[PDB]
Design an enzyme around this catalytic site. Structure first.
Site, PDB file in Angstrom:
ATOM      1  N   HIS A 139      -2.711   9.503   0.826  1.00 40.25           N
ATOM      2  CA  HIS A 139      -2.974   9.429  -0.554  1.00 40.25           C
ATOM      3  C   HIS A 139      -4.312   8.865  -0.913  1.00 40.25           C
ATOM      4  CE1 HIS A 139       1.368  10.540  -1.914  1.00 40.25           C
ATOM      5  NE2 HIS A 139       1.450   9.995  -0.586  1.00 40.25           N
ATOM      6  N   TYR A 158       3.810  -0.060   5.164  1.00 41.21           N
ATOM      7  CA  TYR A 158       3.126  -0.332   3.975  1.00 41.21           C
ATOM      8  C   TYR A 158       2.482  -1.757   4.040  1.00 41.21           C
ATOM      9  CZ  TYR A 158       4.371   4.215   1.716  1.00 41.21           C
ATOM     10  OH  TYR A 158       4.798   5.405   1.426  1.00 41.21           O
ATOM     11  N   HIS A 212       3.812  -0.600  -2.100  1.00 44.30           N
ATOM     12  CA  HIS A 212       4.805  -0.599  -1.062  1.00 44.30           C
ATOM     13  C   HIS A 212       5.922  -0.599  -1.447  1.00 44.30           C
ATOM     14  CE1 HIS A 212       6.062  -1.501   3.023  1.00 44.30           C
ATOM     15  NE2 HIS A 212       6.681  -2.366   2.686  1.00 44.30           N
ATOM     16  N   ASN A 245       6.940  10.628  -5.178  1.00 47.52           N
ATOM     17  CA  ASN A 245       6.041  11.737  -5.299  1.00 47.52           C
ATOM     18  C   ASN A 245       6.481  12.736  -6.524  1.00 47.52           C
ATOM     19  OD1 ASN A 245       4.541  11.372  -3.028  1.00 47.52           O
ATOM     20  ND2 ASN A 245       6.061  12.439  -1.671  1.00 47.52           N
TER      21      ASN A 245
HETATM   22  C1  HEM Z   1       9.466   9.291   0.875  1.00 49.22           C
HETATM   23  C2  HEM Z   1       8.547   9.806   1.008  1.00 49.22           C
HETATM   24  C3  HEM Z   1       7.121   9.029   0.608  1.00 49.22           C
HETATM   25  C4  HEM Z   1       6.787   9.114  -0.622  1.00 49.22           C
HETATM   26  C5  HEM Z   1       7.294   9.266  -1.851  1.00 49.22           C
HETATM   27  C6  HEM Z   1       5.263   8.281  -0.147  1.00 49.22           C
HETATM   28  C7  HEM Z   1       4.555   7.857  -1.337  1.00 49.22           C
HETATM   29  C8  HEM Z   1       3.174   7.289  -1.005  1.00 49.22           C
HETATM   30  C9  HEM Z   1       2.324   7.149  -2.198  1.00 49.22           C
HETATM   31  C10 HEM Z   1       2.374   7.672  -3.617  1.00 49.22           C
HETATM   32  C11 HEM Z   1       1.023   6.733  -1.592  1.00 49.22           C
HETATM   33  C12 HEM Z   1       0.017   6.383  -2.335  1.00 49.22           C
HETATM   34  C13 HEM Z   1      -0.060   4.869  -2.655  1.00 49.22           C
HETATM   35  C14 HEM Z   1      -1.066   4.299  -3.660  1.00 49.22           C
HETATM   36  O1  HEM Z   1      -1.615   4.830  -4.386  1.00 49.22           O
HETATM   37  O2  HEM Z   1      -1.529   3.272  -3.201  1.00 49.22           O
HETATM   38  C15 HEM Z   1       1.740   6.190  -0.112  1.00 49.22           C
HETATM   39  C16 HEM Z   1       0.757   5.619   0.559  1.00 49.22           C
HETATM   40  C17 HEM Z   1       1.019   5.304   2.028  1.00 49.22           C
HETATM   41  N1  HEM Z   1       2.007   5.610   2.556  1.00 49.22           N
HETATM   42 FE1  HEM Z   1       3.574   7.090   2.092  1.00 49.22          FE
HETATM   43  N2  HEM Z   1       5.063   7.921   1.042  1.00 49.22           N
HETATM   44  C18 HEM Z   1       6.054   8.750   1.571  1.00 49.22           C
HETATM   45  C19 HEM Z   1       6.390   8.765   2.944  1.00 49.22           C
HETATM   46  C20 HEM Z   1       5.483   7.610   3.989  1.00 49.22           C
HETATM   47  C21 HEM Z   1       6.057   7.477   5.315  1.00 49.22           C
HETATM   48  C22 HEM Z   1       7.137   8.053   6.055  1.00 49.22           C
HETATM   49  C23 HEM Z   1       4.974   6.518   5.878  1.00 49.22           C
HETATM   50  C24 HEM Z   1       4.936   5.733   7.066  1.00 49.22           C
HETATM   51  C25 HEM Z   1       6.010   5.821   7.853  1.00 49.22           C
HETATM   52  C26 HEM Z   1       4.245   6.313   4.784  1.00 49.22           C
HETATM   53  C27 HEM Z   1       3.215   5.169   4.810  1.00 49.22           C
HETATM   54  C28 HEM Z   1       2.155   4.975   3.668  1.00 49.22           C
HETATM   55  C29 HEM Z   1       1.042   4.064   4.067  1.00 49.22           C
HETATM   56  C30 HEM Z   1       0.937   3.250   5.297  1.00 49.22           C
HETATM   57  C31 HEM Z   1       0.092   4.103   2.842  1.00 49.22           C
HETATM   58  C32 HEM Z   1      -0.940   3.658   2.265  1.00 49.22           C
HETATM   59  C33 HEM Z   1      -1.401   2.347   2.703  1.00 49.22           C
HETATM   60  C34 HEM Z   1      -1.170   1.571   1.789  1.00 49.22           C
HETATM   61  O3  HEM Z   1      -1.414   1.809   0.374  1.00 49.22           O
HETATM   62  O4  HEM Z   1      -1.150   0.313   1.971  1.00 49.22           O
HETATM   63  N3  HEM Z   1       4.658   6.669   3.541  1.00 49.22           N
HETATM   64  N4  HEM Z   1       2.861   6.540   0.192  1.00 49.22           N
END
Ligand code: HEM
Lengths: 727, 63, 84, 83, 63, 63, 63
Positions: A102, A389, A366, A175
Site C-alpha cells: 500500500h 507492522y 498497525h 481492505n
Molecule cells: C488481512 C489482510 C490485510 C489487510 C486488510 C491489510 C491492510 C493493510 C493496509 C490497508 C496497509 C496500508 C497501511 C497504511 O495506509 O499505512 C497495510 C500495510 C502493511 N501491511 Fe498489510 N494488510 C493485510 C495483510 C498483511 C499481511 C499478511 C502482512 C505481513 C504478514 C502485512 C504487513 C503490512 C506492512 C508491514 C505494512 C506497511 C508498513 C507499515 O505501515 O508500517 N499486511 N496492510
C-alpha cells in the site's frame, strides 16, 4: 511591488467551494474552523510562513537565496558555504522508504461517534457513549503500486482508520473486499512478490496482469475468492467514497464481565456503492493518475464529506462451528444473509491534511494497536500481521520512536520506562527507567483490568494442540465462496468479471498458465470458465465440462450484499457533470441546467475547445474550466450538451469523441435543441434511446430524466449496443 | 393516509427496496405484501418485518 | 540573457514541430488554475517569439496587448538564424 | 475475411487512433473498405498504402513511410476525426 | 398539536432538514408529505420514515 | 387483512426452524411453539417467551 | 404532571438537559410543547419527540 497578483487571485477562499473553483489548499488554511482534539493537538508542530524571514534551519536570516558563495561572480563554489550545504543536504535526504505494500495512498482527518453505548458487548471506551467524539485519521490506498503509481488501477484497495481514543490508539486496518488472498501470513511475501513487479525487470506497475501473479494463483486456489473480487468491478472503484470497507479477520469484543463475542468489522459507504469500468479505469490512469487522491481532496474542500458507517457482524462464542467454513479462515466471507451487519456508529472525513509528507506519508497504521474491549483470534493471517507492522517502522520511519511523529502521537497520556530511540523527542524526568522501582515510588504504575480505564488483559482462550506447522483441514475448501460471489452478481457484473479475467489472462505470456487458471475457473462455475476460455481461445475438455460445482454456502444460492449494483444505492451528491460549451450558449438552457444540478449537490465543469471565456446569447460571461482534451469524459459521471451555436463544435474531433467515449463507458448523455444532431456520431436512432435524454430545450423534465439516470450510476442497458461504436 | 400507497406501488412495481431497522440492520429485497403491523420482504426466503422495528423504507429508484 | 536561446531553438524547428511546441504550452498552461500565472508565462513567450506567443495566447483565450506585440525579439545567437 | 472484423469497434478504433497519431497504415484487398472510418477519400491519400494485395511495391511504400517515422502531411486532416 | 403546524411550514417552505433517528442515524432532504405515522423525505427518491423511529427534527434555517 | 397470524401459524404448524432478530440485533433460533397477540413461545431446547414489541424480524430457514 | 413541570421551565426560561433513548444529551430552553413533541432552543429551534426522550433535567430548581 510583490509577486502576488494585485486582485488577490493567488489565495483561495476559506469556504466550501466546488472542484475547479479555487486553487486547493492545506486544510488548516482552507477550513480553519474545522477542528477536533487531534487537529488542535497538532498546533504545537504546525509552522506558518507569512511575515517571517527566510532562514537556515539554525535560525540565521538569509540575504541572498539565489547564489552559492564563490570566489568572484564567475569563480568556484567555496566549501565555507554552509547556507548552500544545509539547503542541498536537506534536499539530498528528503526521501524515506515507501511502504512495502500500500505504498500509494491518500488521507484525511475526521471523527467518529457511536450511535449508542456498546457496553453490553465491549468495554472499548471509544464505543461507550454516543456523545464521545473520536478524532480519526484515515488513509485509503492501492496495494501493489509504488507511491507514485496510478490511482485507478485494478487492485485491492486498503482502508485504514486510526482512532485516537481516550484509552489509546486503535488502528482499524482493512481492505475494500471482505476476504484476503492467502490463508497463512507465512506466505505473505510469496504472494506479494508474485503480484509485485517481476524481479528481473521491474514490470508491470500497479498491475496483476502478468505471468508470476497468475502462476501463483493457479498453484494456490486459496487465492481464488479474493481474485474473483479483484476481477470484478469491485477492483476499480469510482471514488474512495464509493466502496465498502472490511476488517476481514474475525476479532473479539470483550465486555466488563469478560464475555467474548466474535466480530468482523465493516465500513458502509453513505455515498453508496459505485465503480468504473475497465477501459475507462485503465485509460484514466493515463489521463489523470491522481484521480482518486484528487477526488477525495476536492470532495472534502467542497463540503462533500465522505461518510462511512461502522458496522459489526457479531457471532456468539458458541456459534464458532455452526458455519460450514471456518470463521478463522480469512479467505472466507461471512454472508450477510447468515450474519447481518449492524450499524454501530459513523465516521466523517471532514478536513484535508496540511502537509502530505508530514501527515500521510509518515503515518503508521498497525492492526495490533487495539484497546481493552478488543482482542485477537487465531486467524493465521492475522496472527502474522501482528508481528510485521511494528517491525517495519524501524526502517520506514527510522526508528522505535515513530509514535512521536506528530500524526502518530496518541492524544491520551502515554508513560513508561521505554527510553532512548533514534530521534527521541520526549525528555523523561523519571528518576527511574525500570519497574519495580522504589526511587520514584514505582511510577508509572500497572493498572489492574476493569470496566473502564483498566489495564489491557488478553481473553483467556484455551489452547490445546502440538507445536505444528500445518494448515487447518477446516481451511481446505476453495471454490464455494467464489461461486457464491459469482452467483450473487447481476448479468452485466458477470460480463465484467469475465472480461476482467480474459484481459489479465491475455497478458500472461506463457499459455500453460492461462490454461491452469481456466482450470481453476471450471471448479467455480462452468458458464464463467466457458466465457473466459472462449476469449482466450481455449476449448474446455470433457473432463473440465463435467466438474462438479462446489456446495452452496450454508444453503445459500446468492447474497445480494456481494453485488455492487444489485440494489442500486448510487447517490448523486458529489458527482460531477461535463457541460460542453459552444461560443453562443443558449443561456436559459444553461441557467436551468446548473440550477437543477446545484439543487441535488451535483458539480459541473464547463468545457470548450480552448481556455478563457465564451459569452452566452444574453452576454453572461462563461469562464472555461478546461478544454475537451484537458478534462476527458473519463473524469465525469455524465455529459450535457446545451443548445446554441452547435455549428461551432459540430465537426470538432474532440467534442465528438468526448461523446463517443462517454457513450462507450455507459454514461448518461443529455442533448438539448440542435445538440441532438450529435446522436449521429453515437450511432443512435432518431426514435430515441434509453440513456440519451433529449428535448427542444433544458427544462424541469429534461433535467429530472438526467439526474435519474445518474441515480442509476450507469446505463447498463446500453451494453449490447456499444461494441459497434469504435472508441 | 400515506404508508399504503407508498408500499403498494413498490410492490406492484417490483422495485428493490432497502429497509433500515431500529437495530442498525439494513434489509433489502422486493416488497411482497403488508399489514396493519408487518411487511413481507422477498429474497431467498420471504421474511416478516414488524413495522414498529422499521425506521426507514428506501426505494432503489423513483416509482 | 534569457531569450535568445529559446528563440534559436524555436526557429530551428520545422512547422509541425512548432505546432507541437505551441500545443505543449497550451495544454500545460491550461491546467494552471490561477490564470494570472497563465498570463505571466505568455508574457515570457512574447520575449522569445510573437508567432509563438500569439498561438499559445489564442489557445488560452488571451489577447496580447499593444505593449506585448511590440516587444523586440532577442539577438541572433552569434549571427545564427537557425541550427538544424 | 474482412467481414469478421469490419464492424468491430476495437479494430476500427485501432485504425482511427493510429491515423490521428500520424502513423503509417497499409490496407490490402478488401481491407481498403476501412478507409471509410478514417474518412479518407477513394482517390487515395499519402500515408495510406493500398493495393489488391501485399507485394514488393506495397511493402516498400510502407517501410518508406516508416523511414519518415510519421506522416506529418496528415496533420491538417486529423482534427475532423474523432479519436 | 404542534407537530403539524411546524411540519407544514417546513414542507411548503421546501426547507432542507435533518431528521435524527432513535438509532442515532441522521437523514437529510426536504419534507414531501406526512401523516400520523410517517414522513416522506424527498431527495433523489422519496423515503418513508416512521415517526416512532424519529427522535428529533432540525431545519437548515429557522422558519 | 392480517398477515402476521397466517405467517406465524404456518411456521409453527410445519415445525420449521426460524431466526428471530430482536430490536437490539440479537439472533434467536427455534421453532414457534405457540403465540399471542403479544408474545411468541419459541421452543428451542427450552421453551422461552419472546415479546413481540421486541422482535424486528422473523426468518424461515426454508420457503 | 407533565404540563405543570414543562410550563414552569418554559415560563422561567431555564436551561435544561434532555437525555434521549440512544443516550444522547441535548441542551437549551423549552419554547413550546404538544401531546407529542417539544421545541428546544439554543442556536436553532429543533423539534424533539416525547417518545424519544428519556429524562428532562433542569439546570436549577423550580416549584
Ligand atoms: C488481512 C489482510 C490485510 C489487510 C486488510 C491489510 C491492510 C493493510 C493496509 C490497508 C496497509 C496500508 C497501511 C497504511 O495506509 O499505512 C497495510 C500495510 C502493511 N501491511 Fe498489510 N494488510 C493485510 C495483510 C498483511 C499481511 C499478511 C502482512 C505481513 C504478514 C502485512 C504487513 C503490512 C506492512 C508491514 C505494512 C506497511 C508498513 C507499515 O505501515 O508500517 N499486511 N496492510
Amino acid at each position: 511591488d510583490s509577486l502576488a497578483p494585485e486582485d488577490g487571485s493567488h489565495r483561495p477562499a476559506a469556504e466550501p467551494t466546488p472542484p475547479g473553483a479555487q486553487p486547493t489548499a492545506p486544510g488548516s488554511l482552507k477550513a480553519p474552523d474545522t477542528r477536533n482534539e487531534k487537529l488542535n493537538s497538532l498546533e504545537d508542530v504546525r509552522k506558518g510562513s507569512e511575515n517571517y524571514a527566510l532562514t537556515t534551519n539554525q535560525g540565521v536570516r538569509i540575504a541572498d537565496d539565489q547564489n552559492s558563495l564563490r570566489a568572484g561572480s564567475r569563480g568556484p563554489t567555496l566549501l565555507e558555504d554552509f547556507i548552500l550545504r544545509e539547503k542541498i543536504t536537506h534536499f539530498d535526504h528528503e526521501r524515506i522508504p515507501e511502504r512495502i505494500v500500500h505504498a500509494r495512498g491518500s488521507a484525511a482527518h475526521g471523527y467518529f461517534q457511536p450511535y449508542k453505548s456498546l457496553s453490553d458487548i465491549t468495554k472499548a471506551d471509544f464505543l461507550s457513549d454516543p456523545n464521545k467524539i473520536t478524532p480519526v485519521f484515515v488513509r485509503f490506498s492501492t496495494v501493489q503500486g509504488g507511491a507514485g503509481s496510478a490511482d485507478t488501477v485494478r487492485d485491492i484497495r486498503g482502508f485504514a482508520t486510526k482512532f485516537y481514543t481516550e484509552e489509546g490508539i486503535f488502528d482499524l486496518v482493512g481492505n475494500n473486499t471482505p476476504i484476503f488472498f492467502i490463508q497463512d501470513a507465512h506466505k505473505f511475501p510469496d504472494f506479494v512478490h508474485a503480484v509485485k513487479p517481476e524481479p528481473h525487470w521491474a514490470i508491470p506497475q500497479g498491475q496483476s496482469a502478468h505471468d508470476t501473479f497468475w502462476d501463483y494463483v493457479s498453484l494456490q486456489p486459496e487465492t481464488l475468492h479474493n481474485v474473483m473480487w479483484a476481477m470484478s468491478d469491485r477492483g476499480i472503484p469510482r471514488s474512495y467514497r464509493t466502496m465498502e470497507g472490511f476488517g476481514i479477520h474475525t476479532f473479539r469484543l470483550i465486555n466488563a464481565e469478560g464475555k467474548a463475542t466474535f466480530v468482523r468489522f465493516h465500513w458502509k459507504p453513505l455515498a453508496g456503492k459505485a465503480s468504473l469500468v475497465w477501459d475507462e479505469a485503465q485509460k484514466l490512469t493515463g489521463r489523470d493518475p491522481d484521480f482518486h487522491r484528487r477526488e477525495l481532496w476536492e470532495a472534502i474542500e467542497a463540503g462533500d464529506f465522505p461518510e462511512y458507517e461502522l458496522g459489526f457482524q457479531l457471532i456468539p462464542e458458541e456459534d464458532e462451528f455452526k458455519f460450514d467454513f471456518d470463521l478463522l479462515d480469512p479467505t472466507k466471507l461471512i454472508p450477510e444473509e447468515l450474519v447481518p451487519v449492524q450499524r454501530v456508529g459513523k465516521m466523517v472525513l471532514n478536513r484535508n491534511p496540511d502537509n502530505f509528507f508530514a501527515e500521510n506519508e509518515q503515518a503508521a497504521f498497525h492492526p495490533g494497536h487495539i484497546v481493552p474491549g478488543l482482542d485477537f483470534t487465531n486467524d493465521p493471517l492475522l496472527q502474522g500481521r501482528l508481528f510485521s507492522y511494528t517491525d517495519t517502522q524501524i526502517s520506514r520511519l527510522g526508528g522505535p520512536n515513530f509514535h512521536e511523529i506528530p500524526i502518530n502521537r496518541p492524544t491520551c497520556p502515554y508513560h513508561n520506562f521505554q527510553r532512548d530511540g533514534m530521534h527521541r523527542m520526549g525528555i523523561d524526568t523519571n528518576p527511574a527507567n525500570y519497574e519495580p522501582n522504589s526511587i520514584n515510588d514505582n511510577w508509572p504504575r500497572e493498572t489492574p483490568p476493569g470496566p473502564k480505564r483498566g489495564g489491557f488483559e488478553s481473553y483467556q482462550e484455551r489452547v490445546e494442540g502440538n507445536k505444528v506447522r500445518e494448515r487447518s483441514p477446516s481451511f481446505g475448501e476453495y471454490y464455494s465462496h467464489p461461486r457464491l460471489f459469482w452467483l450473487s452478481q447481476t448479468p452485466f457484473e458477470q460480463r465484467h468479471i469475465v472480461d476482467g479475467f480474459s484481459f489479465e489472462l491475455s497478458k500472461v505470456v506463457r499459455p500453460y498458465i492461462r490454461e491452469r487458471v481456466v482450470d481453476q475457473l471450471a471448479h467455480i462455475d462452468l458458464t464463467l470458465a466457458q466465457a473466459v476460455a472462449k476469449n482466450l481461445g481455449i476449448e474446455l475438455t470433457d473432463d473440465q465440462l463435467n466438474i462438479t460445482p462446489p456446495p452452496d454456502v450454508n444453503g445459500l444460492k446468492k447474497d445480494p450484499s456481494l453485488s455492487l449494483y444489485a440494489i442500486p444505492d448510487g447517490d448523486v451528491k458529489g458527482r460531477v457533470v461535463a457541460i460542453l460549451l459552444n461560443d453562443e450558449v443558449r443561456s436559459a438552457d444553461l441557467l436551468a441546467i446548473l440550477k437543477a444540478l446545484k439543487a441535488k449537490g451535483v458539480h459541473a465543469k464547463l468545457l470548450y475547445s480552448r481556455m478563457g471565456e465564451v459569452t452566452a446569447d444574453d452576454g453572461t460571461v462563461l469562464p472555461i474550466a478546461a478544454t475537451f482534451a484537458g478534462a476527458p469524459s473519463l473524469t465525469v459521471d455524465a455529459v450535457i450538451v446545451p443548445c446554441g451555436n452547435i455549428a461551432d463544435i459540430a465537426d470538432n474531433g474532440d467534442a465528438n469523441y468526448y461523446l463517443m467515449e462517454a457513450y462507450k463507458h455507459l454514461k448518461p448523455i443529455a442533448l438539448a435543441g440542435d445538440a441532438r444532431k450529435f446522436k449521429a456520431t453515437i450511432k443512435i436512432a432518431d426514435q430515441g434511446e434509453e440513456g440519451i435524454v433529449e428535448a427542444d430545450s433544458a427544462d424541469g423534465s429534461f433535467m429530472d430524466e438526467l439526474l435519474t439516470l445518474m441515480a442509476a450510476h450507469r446505463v447498463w442497458s446500453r451494453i449490447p449496443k456499444i461494441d459497434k461504436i469504435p472508441a | 393516509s400515506l404508508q399504503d400507497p407508498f408500499l403498494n406501488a413498490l410492490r406492484r412495481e417490483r422495485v428493490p427496496v432497502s429497509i433500515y431497522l431500529v437495530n442498525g440492520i439494513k434489509l433489502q429485497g422486493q416488497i411482497e405484501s403488508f399489514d396493519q403491523f408487518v411487511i413481507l420482504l422477498k429474497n431467498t426466503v420471504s421474511q416478516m418485518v414488524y413495522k414498529h422495528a422499521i425506521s426507514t423504507v428506501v426505494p432503489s429508484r423513483p416509482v
